[PDB]
Amino acid sequence: MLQKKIEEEAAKYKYAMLKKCCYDGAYRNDDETCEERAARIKIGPKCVKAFKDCCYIANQVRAEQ
């Protein structure tokens, strides 16, 4: 489900800001609480969704590397 939601936002690359909300979740160099920062990233419902699923995969690969 999580990877499928990344794919449904980051497939439709015409929706540039919303897949870049994904990629705002994917720059996991903060290591603290990304959902408090995406309480501040309030740009749209799809933006928080892209951000949250990308942050979860990014956090779980950061827990590995």
Side-chain angles (χ1 to χ4, degrees):
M1 187 180 264
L2 282 66
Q3 70 293 93
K4 179 57 64 182
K5 290 173 88 294
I6 302 171
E7 184 257 277
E8 295 171 283
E9 297 295 289
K12 57 177 186 279
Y13 258 44
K14 295 179 181 180
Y15 289 98
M17 294 179 93
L18 297 310
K19 70 93 179 186
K20 203 242 183 286
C21 291
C22 218
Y23 304 179
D24 299 329
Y27 324 130
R28 193 70 172 146
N29 297 102
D30 75 305
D31 288 66
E32 62 118 325
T33 303
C34 68
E35 292 184 84
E36 195 206 274
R37 300 294 174 192
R40 299 176 185 87
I41 301 108
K42 58 191 154 283
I43 304 300
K46 279 194 161 296
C47 176
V48 236
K49 288 181 180 180
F51 202 115
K52 181 175 173 66
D53 290 289
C54 266
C55 182
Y56 294 166
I57 305 314
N59 190 87
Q60 274 67 274
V61 301
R62 187 64 65 234
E64 185 272 300
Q65 59 186 266

